[PDB]
Symmetry: D2
Protein backbone atom coordinates (compact mmCIF):
# COMPACT_ATOMS: atom_id res chain seq x y z
CA UNK A 1 0.00 0.00 0.00
CA UNK A 2 0.80 3.67 -0.47
CA UNK A 3 -1.28 6.06 1.61
CA UNK A 4 -3.98 7.87 -0.36
CA UNK A 5 -4.32 11.62 -0.77
CA UNK A 6 -5.33 13.67 2.26
CA UNK A 7 -9.09 13.27 2.75
CA UNK A 8 -11.38 15.52 4.85
CA UNK A 9 -12.67 14.11 8.13
CA UNK A 10 -16.32 12.91 8.20
CA UNK A 11 -18.70 12.17 11.02
CA UNK A 12 -17.13 8.65 11.16
CA UNK A 13 -13.71 10.04 11.47
CA UNK A 14 -14.98 12.04 14.44
CA UNK A 15 -16.62 9.00 15.99
CA UNK A 16 -13.26 7.21 15.81
CA UNK A 17 -11.55 10.24 17.32
CA UNK A 18 -14.08 10.43 20.18
CA UNK A 19 -13.28 6.78 21.09
CA UNK A 20 -9.57 7.46 20.92
CA UNK A 21 -9.87 10.54 23.14
CA UNK A 22 -11.29 8.33 25.86
CA UNK A 23 -8.60 5.66 25.41
CA UNK A 24 -5.82 8.24 25.61
CA UNK A 25 -7.25 9.72 28.81
CA UNK A 26 -7.78 6.36 30.44
CA UNK A 27 -4.55 4.56 29.58
CA UNK A 28 -1.99 7.26 28.85
CA UNK A 29 -3.63 9.91 31.09
CA UNK A 30 -3.63 12.44 28.25
CA UNK A 31 -6.26 15.15 28.43
CA UNK A 32 -7.23 17.73 25.76
CA UNK A 33 -9.70 20.63 25.75
CA UNK A 34 -11.04 19.59 22.31
CA UNK A 35 -10.50 16.63 20.02
CA UNK A 36 -11.73 17.49 16.52
CA UNK A 37 -10.91 15.26 13.58
CA UNK A 38 -9.60 17.32 10.62
CA UNK A 39 -8.38 14.93 7.90
CA UNK A 40 -6.95 11.48 7.25
CA UNK A 41 -5.00 9.27 4.92
CA UNK A 42 -5.56 5.58 4.30
CA UNK A 43 -2.97 2.84 3.77
CA UNK A 44 -3.67 -0.75 2.66
CA UNK A 45 -1.96 -3.32 4.87
CA UNK A 46 -1.77 -6.99 3.84
CA UNK A 47 0.86 -9.43 5.04
CA UNK A 48 2.01 -11.71 7.82
CA UNK A 49 3.06 -10.73 11.33
CA UNK A 50 5.67 -13.08 12.80
CA UNK A 51 6.22 -13.48 16.51
CA UNK A 52 9.59 -15.18 16.79
CA UNK A 53 11.50 -16.58 19.78
CA UNK A 54 15.23 -16.11 19.18
CA UNK A 55 18.03 -17.62 21.32
CA UNK A 56 20.70 -15.00 21.99
CA UNK A 57 23.06 -17.15 24.07
CA UNK A 58 23.15 -19.09 27.35
CA UNK A 59 19.82 -18.52 29.11
CA UNK A 60 18.98 -15.41 27.10
CA UNK A 61 16.19 -15.05 24.51
CA UNK A 62 14.29 -12.24 22.83
CA UNK A 63 10.91 -12.23 21.15
CA UNK A 64 10.49 -10.40 17.88
CA UNK A 65 7.43 -8.99 16.12
CA UNK A 66 8.19 -8.73 12.40
CA UNK A 67 5.86 -7.76 9.54
CA UNK A 68 6.27 -9.19 6.04
CA UNK A 69 4.10 -7.52 3.40
CA UNK A 70 2.56 -9.26 0.40
CA UNK A 71 3.30 -10.41 -2.21
CA UNK A 72 4.50 -13.84 -1.14
CA UNK A 73 7.87 -13.37 -2.85
CA UNK A 74 8.51 -10.07 -1.03
CA UNK A 75 11.39 -10.63 1.37
CA UNK A 76 11.70 -7.15 2.84
CA UNK A 77 10.66 -6.99 6.46
CA UNK A 78 9.86 -4.55 9.22
CA UNK A 79 10.92 -5.10 12.84
CA UNK A 80 7.79 -3.64 14.52
CA UNK A 81 8.69 -4.35 18.15
CA UNK A 82 10.58 -6.76 20.43
CA UNK A 83 10.77 -8.00 24.01
CA UNK A 84 14.00 -8.10 26.03
CA UNK A 85 15.09 -10.56 28.68
CA UNK A 86 12.86 -13.42 27.61
CA UNK A 87 13.36 -16.99 28.88
CA UNK A 88 13.45 -20.25 26.99
CA UNK A 89 10.04 -21.50 27.85
CA UNK A 90 8.16 -18.20 27.79
CA UNK A 91 5.04 -18.20 25.63
CA UNK A 92 5.01 -16.21 22.37
CA UNK A 93 2.22 -13.84 23.42
CA UNK A 94 0.99 -11.09 21.06
CA UNK A 95 2.48 -7.69 21.72
CA UNK B 1 -6.82 -18.37 7.19
CA UNK B 2 -7.90 -16.63 10.41
CA UNK B 3 -6.36 -13.44 11.81
CA UNK B 4 -5.89 -15.50 14.91
CA UNK B 5 -2.22 -16.12 15.67
CA UNK B 6 -1.22 -19.63 14.65
CA UNK B 7 -0.19 -22.26 17.16
CA UNK B 8 3.53 -22.25 17.93
CA UNK B 9 5.53 -23.71 15.03
CA UNK B 10 9.22 -24.75 15.17
CA UNK B 11 11.61 -22.48 13.35
CA UNK B 12 12.46 -23.20 9.71
CA UNK B 13 15.25 -21.78 7.55
CA UNK B 14 12.79 -19.03 6.54
CA UNK B 15 12.30 -18.14 10.21
CA UNK B 16 16.07 -17.94 10.54
CA UNK B 17 16.38 -15.80 7.40
CA UNK B 18 13.95 -13.36 9.08
CA UNK B 19 15.99 -13.31 12.28
CA UNK B 20 19.21 -12.74 10.30
CA UNK B 21 17.65 -9.84 8.43
CA UNK B 22 16.58 -7.94 11.50
CA UNK B 23 19.43 -8.77 13.85
CA UNK B 24 21.65 -5.72 13.26
CA UNK B 25 18.84 -3.32 13.94
CA UNK B 26 18.17 -4.99 17.29
CA UNK B 27 21.87 -5.19 18.17
CA UNK B 28 21.92 -1.39 17.90
CA UNK B 29 19.36 -1.33 20.68
CA UNK B 30 21.47 -3.24 23.19
CA UNK B 31 24.73 -1.55 22.13
CA UNK B 32 26.34 -5.02 21.65
CA UNK B 33 26.66 -7.93 19.22
CA UNK B 34 24.78 -11.07 20.13
CA UNK B 35 27.13 -14.01 20.23
CA UNK B 36 24.18 -16.10 18.82
CA UNK B 37 20.85 -15.23 17.18
CA UNK B 38 19.07 -18.49 16.53
CA UNK B 39 15.36 -18.65 15.68
CA UNK B 40 13.67 -21.30 17.79
CA UNK B 41 9.94 -21.02 17.21
CA UNK B 42 7.29 -18.71 15.82
CA UNK B 43 3.64 -17.83 15.51
CA UNK B 44 2.18 -16.24 12.34
CA UNK B 45 -0.76 -13.85 12.14
CA UNK B 46 -2.41 -12.79 8.91
CA UNK B 47 -3.01 -9.05 8.80
CA UNK B 48 -5.21 -7.51 6.12
CA UNK B 49 -7.06 -4.21 6.43
CA UNK B 50 -6.71 -0.46 6.24
CA UNK B 51 -4.48 1.79 8.31
CA UNK B 52 -5.75 5.32 8.78
CA UNK B 53 -3.57 8.24 9.75
CA UNK B 54 -5.81 10.89 11.32
CA UNK B 55 -5.04 14.54 12.04
CA UNK B 56 -6.91 15.87 15.10
CA UNK B 57 -7.13 19.47 16.36
CA UNK B 58 -6.67 19.66 20.12
CA UNK B 59 -7.01 23.43 20.50
CA UNK B 60 -5.11 26.57 19.56
CA UNK B 61 -2.32 25.56 17.16
CA UNK B 62 -1.97 22.10 18.69
CA UNK B 63 -2.63 18.86 16.83
CA UNK B 64 -2.46 15.09 17.41
CA UNK B 65 -1.85 12.38 14.80
CA UNK B 66 -3.41 8.93 15.22
CA UNK B 67 -2.79 5.60 13.54
CA UNK B 68 -5.78 3.26 13.70
CA UNK B 69 -6.39 -0.06 11.98
CA UNK B 70 -9.55 -1.49 10.44
CA UNK B 71 -9.39 -5.21 9.66
CA UNK B 72 -11.13 -6.88 6.74
CA UNK B 73 -13.83 -7.75 5.95
CA UNK B 74 -15.21 -4.52 4.51
CA UNK B 75 -18.30 -4.67 6.75
CA UNK B 76 -16.17 -4.68 9.89
CA UNK B 77 -16.58 -1.28 11.53
CA UNK B 78 -14.30 -1.90 14.54
CA UNK B 79 -11.02 -0.07 14.58
CA UNK B 80 -8.14 -0.34 17.02
CA UNK B 81 -5.69 2.29 18.10
CA UNK B 82 -2.13 1.50 16.97
CA UNK B 83 -0.16 4.68 17.80
CA UNK B 84 -0.46 8.40 18.43
CA UNK B 85 1.77 11.44 18.32
CA UNK B 86 1.19 14.74 20.14
CA UNK B 87 2.70 18.15 19.46
CA UNK B 88 1.83 18.30 15.74
CA UNK B 89 1.08 21.30 13.53
CA UNK B 90 -1.74 22.16 11.15
CA UNK B 91 0.40 21.67 8.04
CA UNK B 92 2.34 18.63 9.32
CA UNK B 93 2.16 15.76 6.78
CA UNK B 94 0.25 12.60 7.62
CA UNK B 95 3.35 10.51 7.24
CA UNK B 96 3.64 6.93 8.36
CA UNK B 97 4.54 6.41 11.99
CA UNK C 1 -10.95 -12.76 10.68
CA UNK C 2 -10.85 -16.19 8.99
CA UNK C 3 -10.88 -16.79 5.24
CA UNK C 4 -13.84 -18.97 6.00
CA UNK C 5 -17.05 -17.58 4.54
CA UNK C 6 -19.12 -15.89 7.23
CA UNK C 7 -22.48 -17.23 8.34
CA UNK C 8 -25.40 -15.87 6.32
CA UNK C 9 -26.12 -12.25 7.24
CA UNK C 10 -29.28 -10.29 6.27
CA UNK C 11 -28.80 -7.66 3.61
CA UNK C 12 -27.98 -4.09 4.65
CA UNK C 13 -28.06 -0.90 2.60
CA UNK C 14 -24.40 -1.59 1.74
CA UNK C 15 -25.39 -5.00 0.37
CA UNK C 16 -28.02 -3.27 -1.73
CA UNK C 17 -25.54 -0.64 -2.93
CA UNK C 18 -23.38 -3.56 -4.18
CA UNK C 19 -26.32 -5.15 -5.98
CA UNK C 20 -27.24 -1.80 -7.58
CA UNK C 21 -23.70 -1.30 -8.80
CA UNK C 22 -23.45 -4.61 -10.59
CA UNK C 23 -27.00 -4.98 -11.84
CA UNK C 24 -26.58 -3.54 -15.35
CA UNK C 25 -23.71 -5.81 -16.14
CA UNK C 26 -25.79 -8.85 -15.20
CA UNK C 27 -28.86 -7.57 -17.07
CA UNK C 28 -26.72 -7.63 -20.21
CA UNK C 29 -26.30 -11.34 -19.66
CA UNK C 30 -30.01 -12.16 -19.68
CA UNK C 31 -30.80 -9.65 -22.45
CA UNK C 32 -33.54 -8.10 -20.22
CA UNK C 33 -34.13 -5.65 -17.36
CA UNK C 34 -34.98 -7.17 -14.02
CA UNK C 35 -38.23 -5.75 -12.74
CA UNK C 36 -36.65 -5.99 -9.20
CA UNK C 37 -33.09 -6.48 -7.91
CA UNK C 38 -33.31 -6.62 -4.15
CA UNK C 39 -30.44 -7.91 -1.99
CA UNK C 40 -31.75 -10.37 0.57
CA UNK C 41 -28.77 -11.92 2.30
CA UNK C 42 -25.03 -12.36 2.00
CA UNK C 43 -21.91 -14.15 3.13
CA UNK C 44 -18.49 -12.40 3.25
CA UNK C 45 -15.10 -14.02 2.74
CA UNK C 46 -11.81 -12.28 3.43
CA UNK C 47 -9.32 -12.81 0.61
CA UNK C 48 -5.67 -11.89 1.04
CA UNK C 49 -2.78 -13.41 -0.90
CA UNK C 50 -0.90 -13.36 -4.17
CA UNK C 51 -2.23 -14.08 -7.64
CA UNK C 52 0.30 -15.44 -10.08
CA UNK C 53 -0.09 -15.32 -13.84
CA UNK C 54 2.10 -18.06 -15.32
CA UNK C 55 3.19 -18.55 -18.93
CA UNK C 56 3.68 -22.23 -19.84
CA UNK C 57 5.14 -23.69 -23.05
CA UNK C 58 3.08 -26.61 -24.32
CA UNK C 59 5.16 -27.42 -27.40
CA UNK C 60 6.02 -25.87 -30.75
CA UNK C 61 4.75 -22.26 -30.71
CA UNK C 62 1.89 -23.08 -28.33
CA UNK C 63 1.51 -21.62 -24.86
CA UNK C 64 -0.92 -21.70 -21.92
CA UNK C 65 -1.51 -18.96 -19.33
CA UNK C 66 -2.51 -19.88 -15.77
CA UNK C 67 -3.92 -17.86 -12.89
CA UNK C 68 -3.20 -19.42 -9.50
CA UNK C 69 -3.73 -18.04 -6.00
CA UNK C 70 -1.58 -18.33 -2.90
CA UNK C 71 -3.32 -17.29 0.33
CA UNK C 72 -1.59 -15.64 3.27
CA UNK C 73 0.18 -16.36 5.52
CA UNK C 74 3.57 -16.16 3.83
CA UNK C 75 4.50 -19.69 4.94
CA UNK C 76 1.49 -21.18 3.17
CA UNK C 77 2.80 -23.05 0.13
CA UNK C 78 -0.57 -24.30 -1.17
CA UNK C 79 -1.85 -22.71 -4.33
CA UNK C 80 -5.16 -23.18 -6.10
CA UNK C 81 -5.95 -22.98 -9.76
CA UNK C 82 -8.25 -20.05 -10.59
CA UNK C 83 -8.30 -19.94 -14.41
CA UNK C 84 -6.40 -20.94 -17.53
CA UNK C 85 -6.23 -19.89 -21.15
CA UNK C 86 -4.96 -22.00 -24.06
CA UNK C 87 -3.81 -20.89 -27.51
CA UNK C 88 -1.30 -18.25 -26.33
CA UNK C 89 1.91 -17.04 -27.95
CA UNK C 90 5.48 -16.64 -26.73
CA UNK C 91 5.28 -12.84 -26.65
CA UNK C 92 1.68 -12.62 -25.35
CA UNK C 93 1.51 -10.36 -22.25
CA UNK C 94 0.70 -11.83 -18.86
CA UNK C 95 -2.37 -9.67 -18.55
CA UNK C 96 -5.04 -10.16 -15.95
CA UNK C 97 -7.72 -12.68 -16.81
CA UNK D 1 -2.18 -4.55 -6.39
CA UNK D 2 -0.51 -4.03 -9.75
CA UNK D 3 1.17 -7.08 -11.21
CA UNK D 4 4.96 -7.04 -10.94
CA UNK D 5 7.42 -7.18 -13.83
CA UNK D 6 7.73 -10.43 -15.76
CA UNK D 7 9.83 -12.84 -13.69
CA UNK D 8 11.58 -16.01 -14.94
CA UNK D 9 10.10 -19.34 -13.90
CA UNK D 10 11.91 -21.27 -11.11
CA UNK D 11 11.75 -24.86 -9.98
CA UNK D 12 8.71 -23.84 -7.83
CA UNK D 13 6.97 -22.37 -10.76
CA UNK D 14 7.46 -25.71 -12.50
CA UNK D 15 6.17 -27.65 -9.51
CA UNK D 16 3.00 -25.54 -9.62
CA UNK D 17 2.72 -26.13 -13.36
CA UNK D 18 3.15 -29.91 -12.95
CA UNK D 19 0.19 -29.94 -10.49
CA UNK D 20 -1.90 -27.86 -12.85
CA UNK D 21 -1.13 -30.13 -15.80
CA UNK D 22 -2.69 -32.99 -13.89
CA UNK D 23 -5.74 -30.96 -12.88
CA UNK D 24 -6.35 -29.83 -16.45
CA UNK D 25 -6.15 -33.40 -17.74
CA UNK D 26 -8.40 -34.78 -15.05
CA UNK D 27 -11.16 -32.17 -14.92
CA UNK D 28 -11.09 -30.40 -18.28
CA UNK D 29 -9.64 -33.38 -20.22
CA UNK D 30 -6.88 -31.21 -21.67
CA UNK D 31 -3.71 -32.99 -22.69
CA UNK D 32 -0.34 -31.49 -23.74
CA UNK D 33 2.91 -33.05 -24.96
CA UNK D 34 4.96 -30.80 -22.63
CA UNK D 35 4.12 -28.35 -19.87
CA UNK D 36 7.15 -26.15 -19.17
CA UNK D 37 6.83 -23.06 -17.00
CA UNK D 38 8.50 -20.04 -18.68
CA UNK D 39 7.71 -16.91 -16.64
CA UNK D 40 5.20 -15.31 -14.30
CA UNK D 41 3.82 -12.12 -12.85
CA UNK D 42 2.51 -11.61 -9.34
CA UNK D 43 -0.47 -9.54 -8.20
CA UNK D 44 -1.38 -8.70 -4.57
CA UNK D 45 -5.02 -9.42 -3.78
CA UNK D 46 -6.63 -8.16 -0.56
CA UNK D 47 -10.32 -7.54 -0.09
CA UNK D 48 -13.71 -9.08 0.60
CA UNK D 49 -15.62 -11.53 -1.55
CA UNK D 50 -19.40 -11.16 -1.22
CA UNK D 51 -21.82 -13.94 -2.02
CA UNK D 52 -25.17 -12.23 -2.32
CA UNK D 53 -28.70 -13.59 -2.79
CA UNK D 54 -30.71 -11.12 -4.88
CA UNK D 55 -34.49 -11.28 -5.49
CA UNK D 56 -35.23 -10.61 -9.16
CA UNK D 57 -39.03 -10.91 -9.00
CA UNK D 58 -41.75 -13.46 -8.19
CA UNK D 59 -40.03 -16.77 -7.45
CA UNK D 60 -36.79 -15.79 -9.17
CA UNK D 61 -33.42 -15.15 -7.49
CA UNK D 62 -29.77 -14.99 -8.52
CA UNK D 63 -26.64 -15.41 -6.47
CA UNK D 64 -23.74 -13.04 -7.03
CA UNK D 65 -20.03 -13.33 -6.29
CA UNK D 66 -18.58 -9.82 -6.01
CA UNK D 67 -15.06 -8.76 -5.00
CA UNK D 68 -14.39 -5.49 -3.19
CA UNK D 69 -10.71 -4.59 -2.90
CA UNK D 70 -9.12 -2.76 0.02
CA UNK D 71 -8.96 -0.08 1.24
CA UNK D 72 -12.16 -0.05 3.27
CA UNK D 73 -13.37 3.17 1.62
CA UNK D 74 -12.92 1.72 -1.89
CA UNK D 75 -16.37 1.30 -3.40
CA UNK D 76 -15.43 -0.04 -6.81
CA UNK D 77 -16.41 -3.65 -7.29
CA UNK D 78 -15.91 -6.60 -9.59
CA UNK D 79 -18.70 -9.02 -10.50
CA UNK D 80 -16.61 -12.23 -10.58
CA UNK D 81 -19.39 -14.73 -11.28
CA UNK D 82 -23.10 -15.43 -10.73
CA UNK D 83 -25.66 -18.23 -10.62
CA UNK D 84 -28.92 -18.17 -12.60
CA UNK D 85 -32.29 -19.60 -11.70
CA UNK D 86 -31.78 -19.68 -7.95
CA UNK D 87 -34.67 -20.18 -5.50
CA UNK D 88 -35.56 -18.29 -2.37
CA UNK D 89 -34.32 -20.74 0.16
CA UNK D 90 -31.23 -21.97 -1.67
CA UNK D 91 -28.04 -21.84 0.37
CA UNK D 92 -25.34 -19.29 -0.52
CA UNK D 93 -22.67 -21.86 -1.38
CA UNK D 94 -19.19 -20.78 -2.52
CA UNK D 95 -18.70 -20.80 -6.27
Amino acid sequence: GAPSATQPATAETQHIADQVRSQLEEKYNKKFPVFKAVSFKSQVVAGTNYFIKVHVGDEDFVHLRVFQSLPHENKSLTLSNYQTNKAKHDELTYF
